[PDB]
């Protein structure tokens, strides 16, 4: 009964599709940008205020903001756990997720606007390059903290997942990752080579 409204080359859509894939869920993915699914596009603007993409809809609800969708998916599919196990770590994961969304995710979306000035697009790219490596190191540290608190547990580190798509769209948008650290480069290549990620980008 679960439906996911999707747009091609939308980084939010690709994140959610990889999350639904890991939780073993089976939702109907509807690329709303395609003309064949235009009947679903009409349905989307009815159940959402702005035809929000992406949107997770069932017979009971329709939710559309990334933090809400991730929280909702965690309620519908408890396995494997989405967030860390302890409340301070879970709160830290939500604060960091709010930051990654504000500085990277919705700026990746802004760069897909067609009426952007050259200087405007370059400032958006340069500002993300400025913080990408620093952000990646916080995510690795916060992931090593949670592994220390629970070695037996195996949760899907959602921030490591989201940062994989930041790197993927960095590559898609020809934005260079500013680091000569051969270890960081080794890890980014390994992030992009996770089988669940490869299956998501077809």
């Amino acid at each position: 009964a679960m439906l996911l409204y999707t747009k091609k080359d939308d980084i939010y859509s690709d994140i959610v599709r990889m999350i639904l894939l890991i939780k073993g869920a089976n939702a109907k993915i509807v690329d709303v940008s395609k003309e064949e699914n235009s009947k679903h596009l009409e349905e989307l603007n009815i159940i959402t205020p702005n035809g929000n993409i992406p949107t997770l809809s069932t017979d009971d609800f329709a939710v559309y903001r990334l933090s809400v969708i991730i929280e909702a998916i965690e309620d519908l599919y408890p396995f494997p756990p989405m967030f860390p196990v302890f409340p301070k770590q879970r709160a830290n994961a939500r604060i960091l997720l709010e930051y990654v969304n504000k500085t990277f995710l919705q700026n990746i979306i802004k760069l897909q606007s067609p009426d952007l000035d050259e200087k405007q697009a370059n400032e958006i790219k340069m500002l993300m390059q400025r913080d990408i490596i620093s952000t990646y190191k916080k995510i690795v540290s916060e992931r090593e903290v949670n592994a220390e608190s629970n070695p037996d547990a195996q949760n899907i580190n959602v921030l490591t997942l989201i940062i994989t798509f930041v790197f993927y769209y960095f590559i898609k948008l020809k934005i260079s990752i500013p680091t000569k650290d051969k270890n960081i480069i080794k890890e980014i290549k390994e992030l992009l080579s996770e089988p669940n990620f490869i299956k998501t980008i077809k």
Binding site: T58, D60, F61, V63, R65, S67, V68, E71, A72, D75, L76, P87, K88, R90, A91, R94, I95, E98
Partner: protein, 194 residues
């Protein structure tokens, strides 16, 4: 005594945190900032953001994460619905209240010196409430069987809107009854006295 919440007067994020902590019956004690020195204030929260909940060496002041942390740190009684589908809609409502309704309070505070701009802001806020009067019919609390975090968000928003001069009275219907029910509750009115 174990946990401490540092608050600011007339702050809805501080009010909704006191309502939530009271609903938890936690042994935390409230400490009103402003009564403390900048040497202490700059040590409680480095960026001077209130409210601040701290215990041991942890300290959280993130606005969108505080009450969710409160409900998970002190689990009983739960402040989210038990049914999955109701809880998903409450989470979306919380995001809509923080992003689309709290800024209305923020702009009313910033331009409260301009009377003419204030009268129009109060007028648009009345029309917004009266439009969704149907959503407040047939439920003791906000679209749920029991008291949730949304009722905490809304209570602190009404308390602060009341202080700014915006009153919810007889004319709002089911909204007004919900407000009367909301303020009848012990945790809300314990934080509403001033």
């Amino acid at each position: 005594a174990m946990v401490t919440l540092y608050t600011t007067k007339y702050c809805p994020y501080s009010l909704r945190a006191r309502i939530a902590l009271a609903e938890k019956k936690m042994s935390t004690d409230i400490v009103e900032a402003g009564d403390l020195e900048p040497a202490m204030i700059k040590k409680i929260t480095p960026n001077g953001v209130f409210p601040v909940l701290m215990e041991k060496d942890y300290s959280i002041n993130n606005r969108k994460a505080l009450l969710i942390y409160i409900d998970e740190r002190f689990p009983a009684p739960s402040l989210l619905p038990n049914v999955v589908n109701e809880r998903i809609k409450i989470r979306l409502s919380l995001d809509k209240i923080d992003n689309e309704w709290y800024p209305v309070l923020d702009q009313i505070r910033k331009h409260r010196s301009d009377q003419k701009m204030l009268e129009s802001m109060f007028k648009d806020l009345k029309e917004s409430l009266l439009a969704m009067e149907k959503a407040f019919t047939g439920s003791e609390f906000f679209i749920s069987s029991g008291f949730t975090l949304a009722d905490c968000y809304i209570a602190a928003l009404i308390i602060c809107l009341e202080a700014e001069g915006f009153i919810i009275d007889d004319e709002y219907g089911a909204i007004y009854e919900y407000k009367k029910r909301l303020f009848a509750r012990d945790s809300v009115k314990k934080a509403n006295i001033k």
